[PDB]
Structure 1
Amino acid sequence: MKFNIANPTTGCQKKLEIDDDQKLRAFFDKRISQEVSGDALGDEFKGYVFKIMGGCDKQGFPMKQGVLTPGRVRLLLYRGTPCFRGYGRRNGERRRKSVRGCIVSPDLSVLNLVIVKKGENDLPGLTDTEKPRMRGPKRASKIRKLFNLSKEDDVRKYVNTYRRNFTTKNGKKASKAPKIQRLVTPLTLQRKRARIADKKKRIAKAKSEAAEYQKLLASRLKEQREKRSE
């Protein structure tokens, strides 16, 4: 069958195709979460360990973790879970769909593998280069952790380090940097101060109203007692 090999360390992916039952025998009878040595899968895959992620069968149906069968079953699935994206469907809407079991079998058309251990020899399509992350941290805490900044270091100047420059199709010079989130500013401090001040004002108003009502009741009671005394 076909295989989709992914190296997260280098952020790379490749497609491979095998037609040899002797090599596929190692993959056969395994499950989604198990690991397999790549020595059987060709001779360039020596010292490599692959971890299965799933796959699709000859009819395109995906494999679902937890279904301990080699065949295809029908399950009522929630939106957002694997095997049921449910785009454009109502909240709380469930759908019954066909999914294949987690056990590898010859019925599979494509498998998914992730490299967990690197072998002696690198592959020309996977491990030579590493596709740089496009977007850097956006949270202030994330930036501080990335740059090992202290509580006094100014994170603001460190965004320009990974801000990216480019040229537009027109030939214009452009640059883009992320908008820092969860960044303490005088506006946030003022908002907190205003919240506390509103709480204080509410408490003071309640106390004043209670005192005024008590004074009115006391005056009325005094007038009533004076009337009663006569």
Structure 2
Amino acid sequence: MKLNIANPTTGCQKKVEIDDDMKLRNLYDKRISQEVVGDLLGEEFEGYIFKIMGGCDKQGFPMKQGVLTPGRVRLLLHRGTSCFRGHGRRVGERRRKSVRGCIVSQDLSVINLVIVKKGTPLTLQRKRARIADKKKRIAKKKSEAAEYQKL
């Protein structure tokens, strides 16, 4: 319902609020990461090509990419990925979180969109030391192997 707009071209972001069906009808029934033409979504968004991506709902459960259901389903997740960065969670652990589907639907609260279109000598020393150490190792080989051979 409330939308965050942020721009990667410049780096500014703000939030706005829409409450008209025949404006948000074309906002609905879309997945994450598709562009939406803002002409209909607001008369002052002509040319602006938004991209719906991310967003959460009330009760705070985000949507996840790849799950296609207008519902709050529970998933087993891996830490660090989307919707789960459980900090200090014993690496390798998994939790079964609650998530929303990828297609936008009615019960959301905040929807995230973006815009597509606006209307040393040390190091040298290490290299040569490595070379010298290996080329003295091989001489050690040829010294003591033959010393043992001659017996």
Q: Same-fold call, TM > 0.5?
A: yes
Opposite residue 61 of structure 1, the aligned amino acid is F
Which segments of structure 1 move beyond 2 Å, counting only runs of 4 or more? none
Opposite residue 80 of structure 2, the aligned amino acid is G
Work out the number of aligned pairs and report it. 151
TM-score scaled by length of structure 1: 0.64
Report the identity percentage: 88
Offset at residue 46 of structure 1 (A): 1.2
Greater RCO (Cα-Cα under 8 Å, separation 6 or more): 2
1:93-113 CA distance string (max 9 Å, x none): 011000000001011111011
Question: What is the match of residue 121 of structure 2?
Answer: 186
Larger Rg belongs to: 1
Opposite residue 92 of structure 1, the aligned amino acid is G
Write the distance in 1 (CA, Å) between the matches of 2:146 and 2:54: 71
Question: What is the match of residue 74 of structure 1?
Answer: 74
Q: Secondary structure at the match of 1:73?
A: strand
Write the distance in 2 (CA, Å) between the matches of 1:30 and 1:210: 74
RMSD between aligned alpha carbons? 0.8
Opposite residue 116 of structure 1, the aligned amino acid is V
- Alignment of 1:204 with 2:139, yes or no, is yes
Question: What is the match of residue 6 of structure 1?
Answer: 6
Question: What is the match of residue 15 of structure 2?
Answer: 15
Q: Secondary structure at the match of 1:205?
A: helix
Opposite residue 43 of structure 2, the aligned amino acid is D
Q: Secondary structure at the match of 2:146?
A: helix
TM-score scaled by length of structure 2: 0.97
Q: Name stretches of at least 5 consecutive residues in structure 1 with no aligned partner.
A: 120-184, 218-230
Write the distance in 1 (CA, Å) between the matches of 2:21 and 2:56: 18
Match runs of 1:1-230 below 5 Å: 1-119=1-119, 185-215=120-150, 217=151
Write the distance in 1 (CA, Å) between the matches of 2:34 and 2:10: 22
